[PDB]
Amino acid sequence: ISFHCYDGYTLRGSANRTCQVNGRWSGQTAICDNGAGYCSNPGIPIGTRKVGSQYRLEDSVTYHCSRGLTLRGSQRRTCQEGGSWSGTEPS
Amino acid sequence: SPMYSIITPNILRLESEETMVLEAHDAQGDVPVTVTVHDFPGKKLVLSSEKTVLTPATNHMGNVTFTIPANREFKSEKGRNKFVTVQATFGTQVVEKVVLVSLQSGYLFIQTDKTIYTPGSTVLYRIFTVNHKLLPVGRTVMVNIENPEGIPVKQDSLSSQNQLGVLPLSWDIPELVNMGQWKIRAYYENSPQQVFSTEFEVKEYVLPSFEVIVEPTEKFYYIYNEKGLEVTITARFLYGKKVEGTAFVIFGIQDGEQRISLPESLKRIPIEDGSGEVVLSRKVLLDGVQNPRAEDLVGKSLYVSATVILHSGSDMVQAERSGIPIVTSPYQIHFTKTPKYFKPGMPFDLMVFVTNPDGSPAYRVPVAVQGEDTVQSLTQGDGVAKLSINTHPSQKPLSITVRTKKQELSEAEQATRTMQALPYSTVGNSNNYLHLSVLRTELRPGETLNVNFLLRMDRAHEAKIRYYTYLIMNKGRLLKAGRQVREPGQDLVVLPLSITTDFIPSFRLVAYYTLIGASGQREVVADSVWVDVKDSCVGSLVVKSGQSEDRQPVPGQQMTLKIEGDHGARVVLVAVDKGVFVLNKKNKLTQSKIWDVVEKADIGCTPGSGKDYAGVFSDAGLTFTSSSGQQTAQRAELQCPQ
Amino acid sequence: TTWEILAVSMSDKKGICVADPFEVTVMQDFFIDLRLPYSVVRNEQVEIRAVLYNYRQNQELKVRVELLHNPAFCSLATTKRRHQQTVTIPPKSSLSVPYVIVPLKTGLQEVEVKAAVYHHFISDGVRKSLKVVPEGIRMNKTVAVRTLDPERLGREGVQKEDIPPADLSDQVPDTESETRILLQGTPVAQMTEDAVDAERLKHLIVTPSGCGEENMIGMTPTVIAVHYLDETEQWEKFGLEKRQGALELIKKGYTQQLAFRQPSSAFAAFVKRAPSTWLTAYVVKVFSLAVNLIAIDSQVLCGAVKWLILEKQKPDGVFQEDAPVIHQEMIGGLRNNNEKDMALTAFVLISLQEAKDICEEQVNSLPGSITKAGDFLEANYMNLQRSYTVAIAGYALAQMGRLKGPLLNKFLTTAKDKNRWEDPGKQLYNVEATSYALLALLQLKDFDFVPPVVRWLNEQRYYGGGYGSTQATFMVFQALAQYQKDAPDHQELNLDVSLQLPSRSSKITHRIHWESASLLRSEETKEN
Amino acid sequence: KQPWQAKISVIRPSKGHESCMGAVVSEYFVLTAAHCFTVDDKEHSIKVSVGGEKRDLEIEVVLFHPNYNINGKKEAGIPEFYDYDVALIKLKNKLKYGQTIRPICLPCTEGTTRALRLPPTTTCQQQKEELLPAQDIKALFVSEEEKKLTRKEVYIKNGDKKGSCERDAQYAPGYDKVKDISEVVTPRFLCTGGVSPYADPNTCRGDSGGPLIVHKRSRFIQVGVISWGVVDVCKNQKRQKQVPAHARDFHINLFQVLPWLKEKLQDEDLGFLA
Numbered sequence A: 001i002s003f004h005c006y007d008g009y010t011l012r013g014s015a016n017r018t019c020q021v022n023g024r025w026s027g028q029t030a031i032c033d034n035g036a037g038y039c040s041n042p043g044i045p046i047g048t049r050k051v052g053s054q055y056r057l058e059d060s061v062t063y064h065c066s067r068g069l070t071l072r073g074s075q076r077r078t079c080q081e082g083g084s085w086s087g088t089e090p091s
Numbered sequence B: 001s002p003m004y005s006i007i008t009p010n011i012l013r014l015e016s017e018e019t020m021v022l023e024a025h026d027a028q029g030d031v032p033v034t035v036t037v038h039d040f041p042g043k044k045l046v047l048s049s050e051k052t053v054l055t056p057a058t059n060h061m062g063n064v065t066f067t068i069p070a071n072r073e074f075k076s077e078k079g080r081n082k083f084v085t086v087q088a089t090f091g092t093q094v095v096e097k098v099v100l101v102s103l104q105s106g107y108l109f110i111q112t113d114k115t116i117y118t119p120g121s122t123v124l125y126r127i128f129t130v131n132h133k134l135l136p137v138g139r140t141v142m143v144n145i146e147n148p149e150g151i152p153v154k155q156d157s158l159s160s161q162n163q164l165g166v167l168p169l170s171w172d173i174p175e176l177v178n179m180g181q182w183k184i185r186a187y188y189e190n191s192p193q194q195v196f197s198t199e200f201e202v203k204e205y206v207l208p209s210f211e212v213i214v215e216p217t218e219k220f221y222y223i224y225n226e227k228g229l230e231v232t233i234t235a236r237f238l239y240g241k242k243v244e245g246t247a248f249v250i251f252g253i254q255d256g257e258q259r260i261s262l263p264e265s266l267k268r269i270p271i272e273d274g275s276g277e278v279v280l281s282r283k284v285l286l287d288g289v290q291n292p293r294a295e296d297l298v299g300k301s302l303y304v305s306a307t308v309i310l311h312s313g314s315d316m317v318q319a320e321r322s323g324i325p326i327v328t329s330p331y332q333i334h335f336t337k338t339p340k341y342f343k344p345g346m347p348f349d350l351m352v353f354v355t356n357p358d359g360s361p362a363y364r365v366p367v368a369v370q371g372e373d374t375v376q377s378l379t380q381g382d383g384v385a386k387l388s389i390n391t392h393p394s395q396k397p398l399s400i401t402v403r404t405k406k407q408e409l410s411e412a413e414q415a416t417r418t419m420q421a422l423p424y425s426t427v428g429n430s431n432n433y434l435h436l437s438v439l440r441t442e443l444r445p446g447e448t449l450n451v452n453f454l455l456r457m458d459r460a461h462e463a464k465i466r467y468y469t470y471l472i473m474n475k476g477r478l479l480k481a482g483r484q485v486r487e488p489g490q491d492l493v494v495l496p497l498s499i500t501t502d503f504i505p506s507f508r509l510v511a512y513y514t515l516i517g518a519s520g521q522r523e524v525v526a527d528s529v530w531v532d533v534k535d536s537c538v539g540s541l542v543v544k545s546g547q548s549e550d551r552q553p554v555p556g557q558q559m560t561l562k563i564e565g566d567h568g569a570r571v572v573l574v575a576v577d578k579g580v581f582v583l584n585k586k587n588k589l590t591q592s593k594i595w596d597v598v599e600k601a602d603i604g605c606t607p608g609s610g611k612d613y614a615g616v617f618s619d620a621g622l623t624f625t626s627s628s629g630q631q632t633a634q635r636a637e638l639q640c641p642q
Numbered sequence C: 001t002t003w004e005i006l007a008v009s010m011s012d013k014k015g016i017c018v019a020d021p022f023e024v025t026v027m028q029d030f031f032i033d034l035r036l037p038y039s040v041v042r043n044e045q046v047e048i049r050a051v052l053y054n055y056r057q058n059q060e061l062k063v064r065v066e067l068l069h070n071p072a073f074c075s076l077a078t079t080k081r082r083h084q085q086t087v088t089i090p091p092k093s094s095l096s097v098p099y100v101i102v103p104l105k106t107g108l109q110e111v112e113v114k115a116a117v118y119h120h121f122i123s124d125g126v127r128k129s130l131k132v133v134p135e136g137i138r139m140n141k142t143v144a145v146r147t148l149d150p151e152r153l154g155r156e157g158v159q160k161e162d163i164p165p166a167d168l169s170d171q172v173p174d175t176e177s178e179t180r181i182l183l184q185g186t187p188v189a190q191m192t193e194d195a196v197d198a199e200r201l202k203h204l205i206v207t208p209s210g211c212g213e214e215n216m217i218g219m220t221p222t223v224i225a226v227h228y229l230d231e232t233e234q235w236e237k238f239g240l241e242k243r244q245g246a247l248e249l250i251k252k253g254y255t256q257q258l259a260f261r262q263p264s265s266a267f268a269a270f271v272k273r274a275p276s277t278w279l280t281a282y283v284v285k286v287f288s289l290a291v292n293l294i295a296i297d298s299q300v301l302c303g304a305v306k307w308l309i310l311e312k313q314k315p316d317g318v319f320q321e322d323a324p325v326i327h328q329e330m331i332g333g334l335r336n337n338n339e340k341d342m343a344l345t346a347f348v349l350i351s352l353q354e355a356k357d358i359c360e361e362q363v364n365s366l367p368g369s370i371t372k373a374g375d376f377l378e379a380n381y382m383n384l385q386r387s388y389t390v391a392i393a394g395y396a397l398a399q400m401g402r403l404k405g406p407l408l409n410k411f412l413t414t415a416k417d418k419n420r421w422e423d424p425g426k427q428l429y430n431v432e433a434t435s436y437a438l439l440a441l442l443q444l445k446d447f448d449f450v451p452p453v454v455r456w457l458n459e460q461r462y463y464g465g466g467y468g469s470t471q472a473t474f475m476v477f478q479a480l481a482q483y484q485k486d487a488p489d490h491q492e493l494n495l496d497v498s499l500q501l502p503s504r505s506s507k508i509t510h511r512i513h514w515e516s517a518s519l520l521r522s523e524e525t526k527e528n
Numbered sequence D: 001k002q003p004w005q006a007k008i009s010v011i012r013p014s015k016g017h018e019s020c021m022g023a024v025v026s027e028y029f030v031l032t033a034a035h036c037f038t039v040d041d042k043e044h045s046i047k048v049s050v051g052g053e054k055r056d057l058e059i060e061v062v063l064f065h066p067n068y069n070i071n072g073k074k075e076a077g078i079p080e081f082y083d084y085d086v087a088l089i090k091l092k093n094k095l096k097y098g099q100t101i102r103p104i105c106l107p108c109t110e111g112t113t114r115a116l117r118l119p120p121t122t123t124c125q126q127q128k129e130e131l132l133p134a135q136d137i138k139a140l141f142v143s144e145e146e147k148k149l150t151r152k153e154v155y156i157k158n159g160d161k162k163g164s165c166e167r168d169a170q171y172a173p174g175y176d177k178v179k180d181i182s183e184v185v186t187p188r189f190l191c192t193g194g195v196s197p198y199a200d201p202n203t204c205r206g207d208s209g210g211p212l213i214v215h216k217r218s219r220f221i222q223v224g225v226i227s228w229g230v231v232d233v234c235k236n237q238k239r240q241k242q243v244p245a246h247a248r249d250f251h252i253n254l255f256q257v258l259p260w261l262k263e264k265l266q267d268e269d270l271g272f273l274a
């Protein structure tokens, strides 16, 4: 599957991703970002659901996997001072 | 004696190409012309400089193009209006005139993707940057986003250079934000006084599943109609299917902005097969105002609100149709396209504009002048009827009252309007006039137009007339200028004019002749006419289904989209749910709204003629200056009078 | 639904064209329509309606519809039990399925409902989301509204304003609070006066005629009127087009004045008359202000200056008058002989400084003579008495930057009622003295003493012209034209507003200028 | 706190002392600007100090970029031309790494790939998408405030505000009559400073040649060299507390000078990518 953003957005991460033999998608996570937040867009890893559209300072996002799947990583991430989200990217 | 003339538009624009026409009457041999443009005042720098030679083989003509430079001399904002020192030298004779300059660089159109947004979403918006010819250009544009209180929240300074005149932008909505009508304002960096805006609403909502169209049987309401006002309620789903349920419909009156509701008119009708009928009776309406006279309701409007509820009780939709005016006559007469100046002894052409009470044009309506009844013109699809009356050679003001002779209707229900036309003041009472009459039909690109020149003068000086001079005004610029010959004895000559795509939406046509009769004085008589073209695209852009119809597609299915447009064109797209237009059908970008902005920025005010020869040019938006002393009046206002 | 596709094209040759809306209808035969509200309160039991539509022509459906379990909601669907019922839907009809839920946690939660039909391979599922807003009423409190102005409210140029934390003793347990801080600049609109109306200045277009001094009485109200009308932009209300008729009258008096120029590069009333110091210097004052309208030769203007420096300048800097002019009405305040050495030296020194930027290369003794003439005015400035001599010697010292100390205090306190420097005697000299001191107030860039001075010159309504009005028309419309060019529309806005919060480590600094004023700079903080 | 910062001093015959700065990139090379030196300046008259040491280190050669030409636009009326304003300083003595002297990492190397926790298959185009994206990028530079070094956090206008930043070069001295504004601003440039979105501190004349550093995950990566500015807000008395709004500063993008940097540092064990 391939990714392509709307007008006025910059695509970072792998634009072309491939499902491998280990049940995981290749490359990095595709993110469409406009560059309007203090932190960058944490994006949506494939299989997750992100709750939180504001990417300002002191904001938070929560992640949930699908049915029968186990979250690895941080369920909640928080934008810190300096432009770096707390925790780690889920999968 | 040789005569040298110069014609320039009324207002010149920054960074744009304007056209300049040079002539030399009663001359033989070549005349070298050196034209130099300076700023006002004092002549500090040369803004433009062009040269040409007037050959008698071209009948002493030569169109010259220049451009106001983008220099920082027009930097002061306290100056309000800007002027230039325009100067042309015909060999040894210098002719000059001060011309008004506007700071405007073009037009700016703002497209949004939706008309209403929730908190937490993101607003996508494009900005199209074009000049005065509706062609793309690269400038610096300042962009503002305002709250309902009118305070700008986010400011930017972008450039449309190397982007093909399309500026994609975005803005996120916070979760906690003020509801109401937000605003997006934008302007050019060189013209900050000319601001262009588009609104959008912010509301907490969910999308409905069906629309309700509230349309009455007529687009008005007659007072003495004993049947009342019948209103049809149409309710269908978004996907085309029809709606079963129940509706709640209530009428009301509106006087200005103070609304007075009518609780006596509450009805509950079932909606079967997506249709329903409801009637407001006249006895209920006359009992609500407590008015024994029925003639005082003329002027007020009526508004209907409907609320349809499904049989499952899962969704309901409120809809409203307002501005249904109560009138004695179903037609209105406006002389807004008709000239206010006539010529004695010559036929006068009236451009009658007939409207429905909601503003739409009327089809097939007889129009005859009261007190004459000779010509009974019928309305076209654009609502225009063509009349003509014979006039007496007198300088009395002409009071014309025009009525309608529509059948299936009495004379008390007919419309009327009276205007006053002032006589054209001649030069020296020589009674030399010139009339311009044109076949009024819907003009489309590709057709040819027959323009007629009628000359009324004495026979002692008609042999000196050998040529006419016509000029085309379109979108505040000069488009084409030429000559039209005349032999002695010909009272009428016809110019065939080809109609291209560049005359859209309308154009004005001026003409003049020049001669010396009796005493050695140069006489100039002129006339103008405004002709509307079919408001369509300059190019073309159609979007249809690339897949050969098939059936109605399934959610998740791929489809092919056929995009049909001009070559080398950047096409931008948007796909909107039609459940958005149920809540807000305002602020849609259409082609007809674009031509409404271009037509309201023209430098010509009066739709035809003037009080004298110099009043024709200033009311059509032109400047004239000659070597014999005849000029036009100054213009210090960027807008029209009143 | 139905999608309405709008398209806009952009060709470089054809231009713009917005397409007609093209409609694509998307529909299925069996589907669920999940109708959800915009927000539900946490722990409030609400009922949602899942409508199942059957658009088949003549086939009734037996459907088993089931609601999926979510831990964020409390319904009858659990982890070890399915909430599924089987219903029968007649053809060309719909059936509403009621479902009760209780949301358990704030945020954006998810609801999914699936269904499938009996003995056929048709199924559908809908997964939409709804906001779980926590319990309570949304409220806002204003913590502080403080007006920011350093130097006024502050000290030394800085202003410190401390903000206390909010109350929030009535807050809902386990809810988020957000504090918004707003910065807003206030626009100012100061200075500027109404210029003298051009309808009152019709009588100043005078054709000059006469001898060497009668030419200058006619040249003066025509040169100074074009200089005043070009800066105030009142050619529309004057009538326009008459500028060219007045530009030819300026070239008429320039030609007649050179006919009385002596071979010593000086000017007199006649060619057999001895050269004059005042008439040569007043020619320099008019000709240097007339370089913006027509052409001015370099060999006559600097030669008049070179005759004023090498021949008629003592090494003290004092300019002595050899032969005075015949018309004593054109000299103005110089007719009164009180301090002739301080008023005539100040009259020529303004003419040397208004021609300083013109004759710097030809006459190399001009930066020397300006230094020589400016030192004589500085010594005896503390001994002047008449209000005209203080005004004429204050503008000759301000163009170099030497009106400071005890000399600057004597210049401002001579004004009676702080609006006029009138002498006890001669109305024409008091009208001229207010305009000499106004030109010194605009060279110092002291805009505080200016608006009472300009308001007195406009309320007097002196429109120039007449006998003895040569200096009185030349100076009032020179100072009032200098006023309209040096007038600001606003005072400075430049606010170095830095915000230190104890929750962070960096200072949040904004600079609010005039163009970026009226623009809120929101900084949100969820910590109180 | 800033071990990589070099202080460069050039003594000229009665012209004065040129106080520039640089960045320690290896054991032998110090990266700085090119307009601090000319062809007439000899190596005995150029002294570089690092680590706060009182002594001056002696140099071997100053390597200019081959495209640098400051007077190459005097025909067009432009006195200055700061395109490709980078230079390397090869020292005479090897630098010993300790607690006060350490290098600064550079774009498109092996150590930069592990410092961002990227896979080793990361290309040089993938790293340019990481350090300089199309947004407003948080960065910092090093300045000298009263004989003491301090950091000034700025924002890199690389997104939609890149257009508003670059058009403010018309107000620079000598550039007041330049026709095309893109003639003096090549794509080898980055833009910092201004009022939107914040009030960034501006670079002084003494901070010229310094590094434009990006702090990400407690590590410091240099992405640019300080070149020139439109408005001189520093007068060696304080910082002029009323700056204008168009006071922008320009830098040299290190992603555009990579084939010259890879050639001159090929024997330095930096491990540039292919």
Ligand SMILES: *[C@@H]1O[C@H](CO)[C@@H](O[C@@H]2O[C@H](CO)[C@@H](O[C@@H]3O[C@H](CO)[C@@H](O)[C@H](O)[C@@H]3O)[C@H](O)[C@H]2NC(C)=O)[C@H](O)[C@H]1NC(C)=O
Binding pocket: A002, A015, A016
């Ligand atoms: C990611 O992978 C996609 C393919 O999966 C790459 O798309 C390739 O893009 C090129 C454009 O340089 C395509 O060439 C063009 O194809 C159109 C087809 O309509 C043809 O009309 C043009 O004349 C031109 O040949 C190419 O077809 C396309 N590849 C495929 C398989 O379709 C894309 O470049 C990759 N991007 C990255 C960042 O890796």
Ligand SMILES: *[C@@H]1O[C@H](CO)[C@@H](O[C@@H]2O[C@H](CO)[C@@H](O[C@@H]3O[C@H](CO)[C@@H](O)[C@H](O)[C@@H]3O)[C@H](O)[C@H]2NC(C)=O)[C@H](O)[C@H]1NC(C)=O
Binding pocket: B019, B063, B478, B479, B480, B481, B498
């Ligand atoms: C100013 O005058 C010049 C010269 O007369 C104009 O240039 C001419 O422009 C037309 C339009 O592109 C050229 O083609 C002509 O088109 C008409 C279309 O109906 C056709 O009937 C003619 O036979 C002709 O082919 C024409 O070749 C070109 N040059 C000359 C020497 O005529 C120019 O358009 C004028 N500009 C304005 C603003 O009036």
Ligand SMILES: *[C@@H]1O[C@H](CO)[C@@H](O[C@@H]2O[C@H](CO)[C@@H](O[C@@H]3O[C@H](CO)[C@@H](O)[C@H](O)[C@@H]3O)[C@H](O)[C@H]2NC(C)=O)[C@H](O)[C@H]1NC(C)=O
Binding pocket: B148, B179, B180, C138, C139, C140
């Ligand atoms: C947060 O504080 C504001 C105080 O400013 C509370 O009142 C709200 O104030 C605004 C501004 O006056 C109102 O907007 C206006 O409403 C009027 C109708 O009364 C309309 O004509 C104007 O065009 C404008 O839109 C707003 O209605 C008002 N809110 C109300 C009355 O509910 C605000 O309520 C506070 N918010 C919360 C969540 O407590």
